[PDB]
Amino acid sequence: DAPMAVWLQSSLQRIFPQSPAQTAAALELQAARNSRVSFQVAFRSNMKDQTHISCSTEGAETLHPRVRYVGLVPMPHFNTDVSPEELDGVGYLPGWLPDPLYPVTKTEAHPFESRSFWITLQIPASLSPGIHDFHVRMRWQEGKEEKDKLLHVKVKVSALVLQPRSNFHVTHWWRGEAIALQYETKMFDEQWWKLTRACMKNLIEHGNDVAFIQNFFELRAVFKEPCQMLIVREPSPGKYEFDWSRIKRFVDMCRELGYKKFEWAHLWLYWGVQDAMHVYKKEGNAYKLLWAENLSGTSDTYIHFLKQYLPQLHRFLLKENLLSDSYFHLSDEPWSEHVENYKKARNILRQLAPWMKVMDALSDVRYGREQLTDIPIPIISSDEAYRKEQIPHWVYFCTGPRNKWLNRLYDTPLPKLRMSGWLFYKLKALGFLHWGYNFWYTLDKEQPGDPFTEGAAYAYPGIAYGDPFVVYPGPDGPYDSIRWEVFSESLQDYAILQSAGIQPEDPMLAALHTYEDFPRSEQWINETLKKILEKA
Template sequence: MTAPVPIEARLTDTLRRVYPCTRLDELARLGIVPIPRNGAASFQIAIHNATPEPIRVSASVVSSDELAATIRRVGLVPMRHHNTATPRNHLDGVGHVPGFVPDPLFPGAETTIGPFETQAFWISLHAADAPRRHRPSGRAADGGRLHSVPVTITCEDGFRQTLEASVRLADLVLQPLDDFPITHWFYADALCDWYCCGPFEAAFWPVAERYMTNLTRHHNTCVYVPLFTPPTDGVKRPTQLLGVRRRRDGTYAFSFAQVRRWLRTARRCGARFFEWTHFFTQWGVERALRIYRSNADEQSLLWPPETAATSPVYREFLRQLLPQLRVFLEEEGVLDCSYFHVSDEPGVQHVENYRAAREMLRALAPWMKVCDALSDIEFGRLGLTDIPIPSIHAAPDYVAAGIPAWTYFCCGPRGTYLNRLMDTPLGKIRMAGRLLHRLGAQGFLHWGYNYWYRSQTRELIDPFDEQAGGAWPGWPYGDPFVVYPGHDGPIDSIRWEVWAEAMQDLAILRQTGIASDHPELASIEGYGAFDWSGPSSPLDWGVPSR
């Protein structure tokens, strides 16, 4: 009598989360996976334990000369509620939330699957940028070359099963997004607090470099530079790169040594653009920044925290700093690829404050290129910023007015809009690159790469237990961060991986010159009006190979 098979397995795409109670027949079988040269692709193997006992399972994947394959375990984290203000048909995990949801991708390829439970492994592929001489696989009918990627699962009782994924390696060699700034705010204080190191001491830099590398590998082309401690989301631990000393005669001496090290580390990691700290406080443009003589001494402020934004003391500080900053940027060769901020998210009621601060900067540094997250079209019409960054709900107003702009989302909008939350369908996230291309965005900003704090405080949360900064429903689950803190570097989330493939789609669209009115994009009417049921790769649209 044949022994019963203890597990069932299925290869599936990465557009669907695999929950502990997911049935394999709910998951689409994996089709042919397209991948550009020098690009990435992914798929999952879902495994169901059909027995009343736990089973220890390992998985392995075979790489080739042209396709490097890595495998990670899809981890589960608790999600206590669905995010709010979203229709049921735009929520993932209905029936699974509250409960454990898949998000972190842990290194390693072993797991214990409980009785009648389903888990998954995530297989990431990276293609060589040039073909090797030995090509054992056949050519696909629609171009490119077909490769087989075997994935083997092994149970502790010796049971083994191998499934093969078909991967189409396209002729297109992916080029970097050199002309499209994408930025996620990178919190140096979070690294210091989580990894128990002082700002910019020796132990800090190897950790920071791993996170910067992670950013750029996910097509994040722009790296945040904390020239000063960021004045966003509460009063933060001092993490100021710029060294400042006030001389007896009232003038300032500046040291750019740590700024230089940060820039050069970021460039070595692949950064192409640089975003600099806001010069004024958030949500009102009312105050000067907190500038410290020492990151180790919070009482070493150069002026009281209530100092007005355009006060004489702050204007004099900037008058001395900004010419030296320009010289430094020119010496480092980054002036033309740097973006500066006045203040984050001013409302229309703050127009006059913003105008006064912007005019002060313009008088002191006419060379400075300024961009800010501000959604009211009045800012654009008045020309108060060089590069407006409206929320995706307001971005169409800027397009209609003929005002070039980046765009962003954060806690909202929700509902039918694009977002990247714990219960945003993965297919919806994967549409991001197409939406940015179709709807005329010239860059993208998000505030939450690694914000591992309780909202507006310095209190660390456990990201593996709380993903809304303790502020749900105002802050939705999944908004404050896209990576988890690992032992010595970042742990990717599946949201971050799918986002990276969406940005790869954007790179392909821009590289191949596909028009924004291409038939495959024509159904996109807005950031909240698009079909995300089954996005195909642009590689399947017959794109040219150059």
């Protein structure tokens, strides 16, 4: 019955506004050295009158603590095709959903509403192993009396020191046009470049080690201001020249941030493999297409442009030392019938750019086995087939699959999401790709949206709430979300397995059978980490 409740809680449990108060005061955490670890400080006012509340740490200076506030976004409906066993928030949703993380340490406490701060700890490589403790102080007012409570946090620091992940690469298709739309700035202006640096820095600090370049704008939809980072001009009919200066700046920036791998945009448009890319040239204030919207992939015009572009790309790659460090795309998901479309396109590349190896989403194993692509990217629900053929591959996931399958949605429970990197490791994926880092705007339209009130690009239920974006637009760059912090900590768990020498075949991982059939409790994660980290 206390006027104000405050408790500690782990990073794998959502707190909904109408959650009941808990009592805690004490939390123990575990961490490898050179790693990052998270927890929540929850609070619920039992007072008619609103008040202020402040979160702070004491004695945590060596862990460079970071204190943020968990904001809520509206979730209108549960995502479809998800059984209740696989939904988070049963009893609480549809309703307010915790997700964005805001950089404040003081907020207003509202009557009878459970909220939380999110605290991020940096465990340095040099820290002495064993137990390190600190305190969290919560301060508020009851009338004119000042009140406070201390809570006790313990981190049991393993001897294990994490090494950089190897032979596993992660890419997200971040969107320059989303920055242009949500912040209302000219594409490639200097504000655009700050926001882009800030995003790429966010990505690499959350485990994404591949920097996407959209040299060609990716959408079928035609934009007035597309994000085409390659500059193209057409002085006389069918003779093109190319200015690489924007891509060159992006590569400089990403290399300064720590990237070594880069990824290039698609070369044929995703209606099957049947259309050519939309490529624009500047004119007046905005951009205009070089050829017809419906131009075919096998056209004379588009192949005449590839005859000139691909060698220029090769010269750029040489000049900037990017051949061995680039991943290339052709086109996405040809069904069986589309196969010959893509075969023709692939042979065209082999003729014009034999140096270029391709990777693409091919979920049909019978047609990724045929060698259509060079490195296939099945959706996770086709992973098993590729594994029985033992074909090496990347995996991706998007609005689907759902129900029992791994995913990253608003209503995917956090422990399930936290299994991502364990599954990546045990099922021996080469890498993971995802389309929806900051796709903040209206699906397939040059029309900004509102990520703080709309989580499915206005396309629910085909687009699941949570699929388009894991970060939110902040005034100077991205705000993280809970999902993104958990996903990042999951890529870290993949580094824990690797650094500790655990083999995918190890019995402690044997219940991870598919991207569908796998343990998904916070306890399995805690117990398995305790074994690994205390063996050391």
